[PDB]
């Protein structure tokens, strides 16, 4: 079946939209999120006018020519299924189908608990006799209401824009259509799960500055280092790979450095106290009591400024 | 093959049911549970009357028109197989098939050991010449007897109701059918596996309030913190992702906070006892002995009230 | 192709069997074990008699009607392939095929190291003109010789019985065929891997009853608790989910309780010894030396009686 | 298409071979290794003689009859693709295809770092008019050159032999063909990764025999037990399931037993030294210094003899 | 459809290229990386000349003969889809398709944080009437712009060369085409995540050379060994299998050896200090203070020289 003949006044501007249904899978490490949503198309063509002698008409999927719409960014062609084709008697085709696919949106965990991500879908079509203006979207058919699913994100925006980019070959003048879904993580879940316990263990380490027993100080600091490594093991099963950097990955390095400095300070204090310099050891101890929380706050503020 | 012609008195009300067979897979993190069950349809159509010149008749799956029934919430179209079609001589079609699919029911682990979940299946059909009343269910063909499988849930209810909701496009007046399976976790397995050992380790930590040795107190409290983090590592392999909150996830935070407060109290007691205030240190120690279990019980009751 | 016409004396009793080849995959958590075995069918039909003017005849899989045999309990229809069809000149069809599928047998880890499981396969067929007696098995074509594979089980029995159970719809009088494979775990591998080291760590904890140093006692008991949690982490990667209970899962809880009681006893002994009651502390210590192994043996015997 | 007619002098002896390309996947726990290799067949048939009026001829895969060659041991039928069919003018067919499949070779980790395994492939064919002698292999077309891939094995032998074994039904006289690939692990990688650090931690434990401090001895031995359990956790992610036994799995049990005996010795020494028997305690301590390395060497030699 | 007839002057030299789109999956342990890219072909053939009585022409994928191009190194045949065929009126075919497949490039983690890898793609074609010169590449259609994806690599080179290698059978004179993509890891992410914390824990261990307390020294060194094993557990989830060797895997062994030597030195110092040799113990202690960092630097330089 060939596309309907044009009037040559303008290329066939097919209206398209995608109503999200279930963006269920979020493979952060694989940078692939899997969705099973619905896509709706509406375009003008010659059909049953029924002005003389209705309500709605429905043909078969293999009868009417449907424009070939494909996603640039998928592991494989979308697992789709034609749901409802409406040949409106005023004259148009309304083709609604249900597709499921992996979308291949590269997440960016530069600021992991407080990240704002943008899922991307790129639409392309082929040209047979004339170009296509598929990017014309009514912005009314798109949108998922909500569900409290394993996706703990809050949806901010669903902008859809025409972004003509350079193709792999660029043989034709085809322009892809951009669906950008900007979402924000609900970070409250992570404050008592990844952030607060780490600070608690760090403060347990710091409680070694109010003690004079070198052996108890060593127990506190090194057992706290072990506890922090174990808690990092616990946390990193939740975190993605992140082979570049992270805000919460630099706080962990800061905490490692602070354990190192705490060990150094405890050793220095004990060396001074054994070398018969109790006054200097006490001065260093009190300075550490004041300084370690202060330096930690300063480092956290500096890291927040660097990342945010 | 076209649907049988109607009398125009009422739309074709096809009776449907699903008899659960094996809801074997429960991917909590993926929020997908996989089932391989049977679906039965019964509807009126013209066929062999056999009033003159039986028992049962059976046609081929590709011969009789079967209504297109699809699931709203699946990763892919159900992997089905026609099992038995019965063209009853009194006149009807009884189409029983075996399908297997992922159902995409978002679990809700707000109260993980004591959760009551509701698995959801949505049914939709297409319209060719007249609407359909598929939601008419006899409620007799549905139901799985039981099996002591890896599913440790106790089935409470299997309500099936007609829930006309807004579709993605809502071009037609199609109404989906709701299958809701309300089940409850058997929580007894978790009391001696996730709950009691954590309390045992916490009480081991608290046994540091009956001691005067600061170094032994530090050993108890910090080694117990390490043990609690290791036990949390052990537990979280069983738990799902839960990127929002949890009842058992807030008890863990409470236990972390209690370890922090225990360390603070031990340090305060040692500081007072070294600063030549044994009376105040002993008073704080006895108050802690009384208070820590009491505050833990109060916090647990408050959390239970907040979550239940 | 239609089934061969009957004599109406008796329904077509097709003989069936399955010769196991490789039951390679055992997904205990998923409760699915994957096998790639052979199935053989033998039944009477009209064919080349060759009494006048052999040895064997072979037709094409798409030529002869083969009864539709399906498995009740599979994720998807078996990935089969026709291997050899023998139209014996005396008159019969011998259809041997190689199928691979997941079998969906729910394991039961109530007694994990010493469990005896029963893998189940259910066979069903469709009826076109007359019923079928597929359950008639010669019990001679079934059976795998052996292999020392990743399956560490010892095969006990391969009983095959006719078990007419209620179907999902029960429209026809079809009766399924039961293949039950009863196997037993070789538990010797687990005694030096899951059982003996746990007892060794527990006894290391108990060696704190032969000491008077409270701080060394705390080190022994709490570091042993940490070691036991780490060993439980090591073990549970081997174990399945078991969301209900386990014999080896209740021994772990008993060991947790014994660590708790050991900490309590050590704290009581130190409190008495500090409160100037060395005689009572020594009496409690000696009683603990005698009692802890005795109570552990009694608890283990009680648990064995409860589970076995 | 039917097989070419025979001369009845001998059955059609088709020459076969498989040239390994990428045996990339080695799922030790699943006992399945996945390979994507090439298979070549050569057999005599009537074709273009071209003695009057060449170089080579090529037909279509669906035109020439190719013998049905299947693998006994695969999860599913090989994912193959016809690559090159050469109808040599002297008269023969040379059919080379690229197949990828899981091979289902049960590994045997009785001696894990020093194991020598034998990957197995079984070939079977069907008979239509005459038997087949497929087992006739030239042994020249087989073989992979090499690659330094994730397979850290050194290939020893590629023996291919005719092994007529009892089939599942044995209706015909078909004989399978055996491809056995004997390979050996490069064990050097494991000496500094699984073996040497464990010995280092054990010796750290033994350094408690040169000390008189019971509390420091307890710290050494029990913290070393914790370290050994953590290192076992680290190692076992690399190791397969091994539900039967292992050489490196019995060394771990020996090390657990040695930690138990070390704790027992330390407790005995402290009990004697507290009970006012310093001479006996020192004698036991020196005997332990001499004996523990000696007994460990003896146990390792005994285990090596038992396993090798 | 047959390939277009040749002029016999030269074999059909089809120009080919692949424009990378998403090399998203990098299964280091499996040694398979999955890409969904575009491939473009351009070749001369007889078609619409349109010199008398254009712009572009497009046929159907099943109409024009397209050369059979296959990848030597894939798990399965590429999941491709024809995108755009351009029959240029000057006379040529430009066939652009989108394929997704696993590429089977064996990574080489001899120097894990600082590795430079070379992903390999091998192209082969079949011969029907004449040979092919597919290796003729314009080097202009290839190339991915960039994306900050889960791939943390920096692309260095995209060399494409003709590498005629020995085939599995080498029946024809076919020559494969080599696509080599040389990339380099961005190692900065790993310095504060795998390298610096390990050094921090090692230095914490070394702080035991500035102390005289044997029990505190044991606490430092053995608790630091536990911390290092836990951190190795944390790191190895990121690392691949590496069953041969590694630069970062030999630093870990060096650190294990240094913990062993630190324990030995502490034990020697305590033995000398107890055996009434404080001068020798102090001399060994100071020599260790100087030597351990020096020997560690020397060992690291030696390892870097050996690996780089």
Author numbering:
A (entry chain D), B (entry chain E), C (entry chain A), D (entry chain B), E (entry chain C): 5 to 57, 61 to 315
Publication excerpt:
Taking advantage of the flexible buffer conditions accessible to cryo-EM, we obtained additional reconstructions under partial and maximal (pH 5 and pH 3) activating conditions, producing maps to 3.4 and 3.6 Å, respectively. Surprisingly, backbone alignments of models at both pH 5 and pH 3 indicated close fits to the pH-7 model (root mean-squared deviation over non-loop Cα atoms, Root mean-squared deviation [RMSD] ≤ 0.6 Å) in both the ECD and TMD, including a closed conformation of the transmembrane pore. At pH 7 and pH 5, little definitive density was associated with this side chain (left, center); conversely at pH 3, it clearly extended towards the complementary loop F, forming a possible hydrogen bond with T158 (3.5 Å donor–acceptor). At the midpoint of the same β1–β2 loop, density surrounding basic residue K33 was similarly absent at pH 7 and pH 5, but clearly defined a side chain oriented down towards the TMD at pH 3. Conversely, at pH 5 and pH 3, K248 reoriented out towards the complementary subunit. Residue K248 has been implicated in GLIC ECD-TMD coupling, while E243 was shown to be an important proton sensor; indeed, rearrangement of K248 to an interfacial orientation is also evident in open X-ray structures, with an accompanying iris-like motion of the M2–M3 region—including both K248 and E243—outward from the channel pore. Interestingly, loop F adopted a different conformation in our structures at pH 5 compared to pH 7 or pH 3, suggesting this region samples a range of conformations; indeed, previous spin-labeling studies indicated this position, along with several neighbors on the β8 strand, to be highly dynamic. Thus, side chain arrangements in both the ECD and TMD were consistent with proton activation, while maintaining a closed pore.
